[PDB]
Amino acid sequence: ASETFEFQAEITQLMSLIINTVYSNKEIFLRELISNASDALDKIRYKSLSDPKQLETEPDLFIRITPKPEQKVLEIRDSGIGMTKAELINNLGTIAKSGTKAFMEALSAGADVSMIGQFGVGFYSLFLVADRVQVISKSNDDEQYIWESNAGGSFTVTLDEVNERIGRGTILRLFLKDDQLEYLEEKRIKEVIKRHSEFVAYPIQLVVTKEVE
Amino acid sequence: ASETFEFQAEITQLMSLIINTVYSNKEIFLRELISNASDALDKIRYKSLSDPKQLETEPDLFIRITPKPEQKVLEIRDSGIGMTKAELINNLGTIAKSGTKAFMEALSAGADVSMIGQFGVGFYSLFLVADRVQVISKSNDDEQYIWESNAGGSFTVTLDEVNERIGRGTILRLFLKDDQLEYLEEKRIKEVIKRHSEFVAYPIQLVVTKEVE
Numbered sequence: 001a002s003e004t005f006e007f008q009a010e011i012t013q014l015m016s017l018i019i020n021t022v023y024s025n026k027e028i029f030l031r032e033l034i035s036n037a038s039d040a041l042d043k044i045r046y047k048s049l050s051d052p053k054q055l056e057t058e059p060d061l062f063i064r065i066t067p068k069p070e071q072k073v074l075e076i077r078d079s080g081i082g083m084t085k086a087e088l089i090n091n092l093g094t095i096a097k098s099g100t101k102a103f104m105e106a107l108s109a110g111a112d113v114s115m116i117g118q119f120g121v122g123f124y125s126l127f128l129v130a131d132r133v134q135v136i137s138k139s140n141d142d143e144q145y146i147w148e149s150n151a152g153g154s155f156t157v158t159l160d161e162v163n164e165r166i167g168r169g170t171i172l173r174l175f176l177k178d179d180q181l182e183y184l185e186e187k188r189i190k191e192v193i194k195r196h197s198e199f200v201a202y203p204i205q206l207v208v209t210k211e212v213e
Numbered sequence: 214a215s216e217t218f219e220f221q222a223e224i225t226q227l228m229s230l231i232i233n234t235v236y237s238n239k240e241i242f243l244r245e246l247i248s249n250a251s252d253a254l255d256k257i258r259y260k261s262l263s264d265p266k267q268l269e270t271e272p273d274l275f276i277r278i279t280p281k282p283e284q285k286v287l288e289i290r291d292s293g294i295g296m297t298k299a300e301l302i303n304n305l306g307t308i309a310k311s312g313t314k315a316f317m318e319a320l321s322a323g324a325d326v327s328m329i330g331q332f333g334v335g336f337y338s339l340f341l342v343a344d345r346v347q348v349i350s351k352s353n354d355d356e357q358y359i360w361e362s363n364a365g366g367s368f369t370v371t372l373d374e375v376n377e378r379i380g381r382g383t384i385l386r387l388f389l390k391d392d393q394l395e396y397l398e399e400k401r402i403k404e405v406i407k408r409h410s411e412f413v414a415y416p417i418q419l420v421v422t423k424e425v426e
């Protein structure tokens with residue numbers, strides 16, 4: 001039960017410009033995804049001030065980062081507001097984003113890639129380190145869906161019958177490039193968070209697998 | 214798409230006798246589940262000697278233990294052979310087990326609960342620490358299914374559309390009793406494994422969540 005959608009043309013250009021013209025300061029992808037997780041968490045918390053029951057699907061407010069080294073995947077999960085199917089479709093690629101063209105012109109003129117979050121398109125920085133991404137999301141107002149893109153001209157949206165149930169929120173599942181596997185490392189992850197994601201109102205958890213011996 | 218099955222009557226008696234008459238040496242449940250995981254791993258590995266492609270669904274052979282403290286759940290996962298739907302139904306409760314009545318008589322006479330694995334029913338030791346269990350399993354020869362029981366007279370078997378895809382093998386998902394939450398602790402888990410599960414041919418991984426600060 002799987003639909004395909006074409007990306008708005010500037011978004012496709014944006015993604016190409018990120019994958020192919022940007023060389024450094026890649027670690028900023030993690031600040032941007034932590035900022036997005038934090039924005040989603042702010043929104044469910046604010047929503048719950050006048051509708052406490054919204055929190056019941058998942059009472060704990062957190063960000064959690066799960067390196068999956070054998071799969072070469074990094075997951076960034078939040079228990080924020082989540083996105084409905086129509087929200088994944090409208091906001092993750094089909095509709096013109098304010099910022100998209102403006103950001104690409106600032107980049108052309110010499111702007112540091114890190115300014116991407118200030119243009120409201122910092123989601124697409126994930127393509128600095130990942131050649132495939134799934135956004136698995138569960139809004140209180142919809143079923144769990146999977147949005148997926150390999151940075152081509154199109155993305156798919158699919159009713160989620162394959163992943164763990166999230167009570168509420170989003171998993172960013174990044175299929176890292178072979179040159180960017182340092183973001184599977186516990187120490188590298190902690191460093192980038194401590195240096196660049198210093199003021200976050202929510203706990204940030206790191207899931208570590210160790211061998212018992 | 215969810216079927217209910219009655220437990221064979223001695224199995225129901227066994228489970229009651231475990232929950233209600235046994236007081237100590239509870240930690241043996243972990244040795245038994247590690248032994249079962251190890252038996253499942255031996256079987257896929259042996260199967261693959263003459264059918265290498267069996268391993269392709271999940272090339273890594275491991276046991277992994279994931280404490281889920283906010284859910285009061287402990288999961289024990291293996292990438293062994295897994296069980297088909299008909300295997301969950303036949304082997305986990307509907308058919309008479311050799312050992313069941315014999316074990317219950319040995320227990321009555323004073324046998325230590327730890328002898329349960331020697332009677333071939335050591336699976337049911339999980340009821341020392343858990344009041345609910347899901348066995349989520351994926352055999353190469355079937356779809357993923359969920360078997361579930363709260364130790365009543367019946368269990369359910371359900372096509373799995375809610376949990377993460379396992380490539381191949383089994384997750385024991387234990388809903389721990391409130392008095393047995395020590396088995397959520399990293400140090401307690403390591404101790405019981407080091408003391409009682411010393412000779413295991415497969416890596417045993419422990420998944421730990423820490424806050425980054």
Ligand SMILES: COC1=C2C[C@@H](C)C[C@H](OC)[C@H](O)[C@H](C)/C=C(\C)[C@@H](OC(N)=O)[C@@H](OC)/C=C\C=C(/C)C(=O)NC(=C(c3ccccc3)C1=O)C2=O
Pocket residue numbers: 035036037038039040043078080081082083087091092117118120121122123124135169170
């Ligand atoms: C306004 O809002 C925004 C946006 C638009 C939209 C998309 C939003 C959305 O809707 C549905 C929502 O609200 C959400 C909450 C989302 C978010 C942030 C997220 O996530 C999560 N984790 O959940 C995301 O990711 C997936 C999506 C998108 C993003 C983007 C595109 C960007 O980059 N930015 C932004 C953003 C940002 C910027 C900066 C920082 C952060 C974020 C924002 O805020 C926006 O857009």
Ligand SMILES: COC1=C2C[C@@H](C)C[C@H](OC)[C@H](O)[C@H](C)/C=C(\C)[C@@H](OC(N)=O)[C@@H](OC)/C=C\C=C(/C)C(=O)NC(=C(c3ccccc3)C1=O)C2=O
Pocket residue numbers: 248249250251252253256291293294295296300304305330331333334335336337348382383
């Ligand atoms: C013969 O075989 C057995 C049994 C019977 C059956 C059930 C088996 C089965 O079938 C399907 C299979 O083969 C598998 C491999 C399984 C197993 C072990 C497992 O797991 C896993 N992890 O996977 C289990 O759990 C879920 C199941 C069951 C168990 C039981 C009941 C017991 O206790 N024991 C045994 C057992 C044991 C004993 C001792 C130690 C370990 C195990 C065994 O071995 C048996 O039975």
Ligand code: NI
Pocket residue numbers: 182
């Ligand atoms: Ni690098």
Ligand code: NI
Pocket residue numbers: 027192195
């Ligand atoms: Ni830095």
Ligand code: NI
Pocket residue numbers: 161374
């Ligand atoms: Ni279906």
Ligand code: NI
Pocket residue numbers: 395
């Ligand atoms: Ni105790």
Ligand code: NI
Pocket residue numbers: 240405408
């Ligand atoms: Ni002991």
